[PDB]
Structures are given as C-alpha cells and as structure tokens.
Amino acid sequence: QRLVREIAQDFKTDLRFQSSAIGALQESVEAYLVSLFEDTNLAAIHAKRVTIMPKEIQLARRLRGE
DNA sequence: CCCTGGAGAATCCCGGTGCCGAGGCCGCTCAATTGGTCGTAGACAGCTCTAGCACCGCTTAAACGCACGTACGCGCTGTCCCCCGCGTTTTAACCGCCAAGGGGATTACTCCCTAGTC
C-alpha cells in the first residue's frame, strides 16, 4: 500500500486511496507474477537447470508480447 | 605455432532501354450546411452520509546476520552422427497444335404496320 501510494503521488498528488478495491488489484498483480514464474520455470526446465537467470525473464517478457 | 598473395566469387552501383499505371482531366452527383422546432439530458447547487487519516499501545510474525555445507551452472575434456553443398534426376505448370459447336452480332428476305387518292 505504501508503494502504490508512492507511485500514485507523482501521477496525481494528494490521491486519496480508497481502502476497498485494493485487494482485487493485489490479487491480480500476484496472479500475473505467478504466471511469469511458471513461464520462467518452464523455460528453466527447458534449459535443464533449476535456477533463474535474467535471460529467461526477459524472453518471457518479450514472447508474451510486452 | 598462425598470416597472407593470390584467386574465386558475392556486392554496390549507376547507365539504359521498355512498360503500364498514377495522376491529371472530364462529366455527373448526392450528401453536409442551414432555416426552424421541442423536448432531453446534463451542468449547477444542495442535503446528506460514509468511508478513511492519523493517532494511541501491543504481539510476537517476519527479517536479517552468521555459519555450515554442498552440489550445480558452467566450463574443461572427448567422440559421433547427421545435415549441408553440390551433382543428377524427375514432377509441374504454360504455351502452342487441331477440329467442332455456341452464340452473339449482323445483315438479307419479307411481311405486315402505315397511309394516299379517282
């Protein structure tokens, strides 16, 4: 919550965050992340290795379409 | 040990002629402006009400350092297997050949539609 208020101040100063509807956002972000780790884990086992290098993450970003 | 003169060959490039179509020109042409209405929907408060800002003290739940430790990404070794460049062969569209209808126009015979006067 502190982080999102911090990145919301510069977009619009004195932005009052409603204490509701933030759980939905905080579930959607985690959902997209766990999708990213599952994709990078598939890429990792594709590389016969369990650890994660930057390469897997950047190619996941590029091949997903952003 | 590793570097290169020569050679083979791919690249960049501007003359240098032929072509077909981008753009201009001509002739319609139909749809955006504009007069009005009349009534619709959003701006302007206005009362309300409702969630959040900051504050207080706790509670151990996470967070972080330290130390062990240990095994995996990466880099070394080697082989082996399989795919490419080149040489030879075969499907694969494309354009000519022929004699016959189909038909669309095109014109010839004619035949009824039209219209004149002793």
From Swiss-Prot:
The modification N6,N6-dimethyllysine is found at residue 12. The modification N6,N6,N6-trimethyllysine is found at residue 12. One of its GO terms (molecular function) is DNA binding. The modification N6-methyllysine is found at residue 12. The modification N6-succinyllysine is found at residue 12. Phosphorylated by IPL1 to form H3S10ph in a cell cycle-dependent manner during mitosis and meiosis. H3S10ph is also formed by SNF1, promotes subsequent H3K14ac formation by GCN5, and is required for transcriptional activation through TBP recruitment to the promoters. Dephosphorylation is performed by GLC7. Mono-, di- and trimethylated by the COMPASS complex to form H3K4me1/2/3. H3K4me activates gene expression by regulating transcription elongation and plays a role in telomere length maintenance. H3K4me enrichment correlates with transcription levels, and occurs in a 5' to 3' gradient with H3K4me3 enrichment at the 5'-end of genes, shifting to H3K4me2 and then H3K4me1. Methylated by SET2 to form H3K36me. H3K36me represses gene expression. Methylated by DOT1 to form H3K79me. H3K79me is required for association of SIR proteins with telomeric regions and for telomeric silencing. GO terms for cellular component: CENP-A containing nucleosome; nucleosome; nucleus; RNA polymerase I upstream activating factor complex. Keywords: Acetylation, Chromosome, DNA-binding, Methylation, Nucleosome core, Nucleus, Phosphoprotein. Transmembrane segments: none annotated. It is found in: Nucleus; Chromosome. Its main location: nucleus. One of its GO terms (biological process) is nucleolar large rRNA transcription by RNA polymerase I. It comes from the Eukaryota. Present with 213000 molecules/cell in log phase SD medium. Belongs to the histone H3 family. The nucleosome is a histone octamer containing two molecules each of H2A, H2B, H3 and H4 assembled in one H3-H4 heterotetramer and two H2A-H2B heterodimers. The octamer wraps approximately 147 bp of DNA. Histone H3 is a component of the UAF (upstream activation factor) complex, which consists of UAF30, RRN5, RRN9, RRN10, and histones H3 and H4. Core component of nucleosome. Nucleosomes wrap and compact DNA into chromatin, limiting DNA accessibility to the cellular machineries which require DNA as a template. Histones thereby play a central role in transcription regulation, DNA repair, DNA replication and chromosomal stability. DNA accessibility is regulated via a complex set of post-translational modifications of histones, also called histone code, and nucleosome remodeling. This is Histone H3. The chain holds residues 69 to 134 of 136 of the full protein.
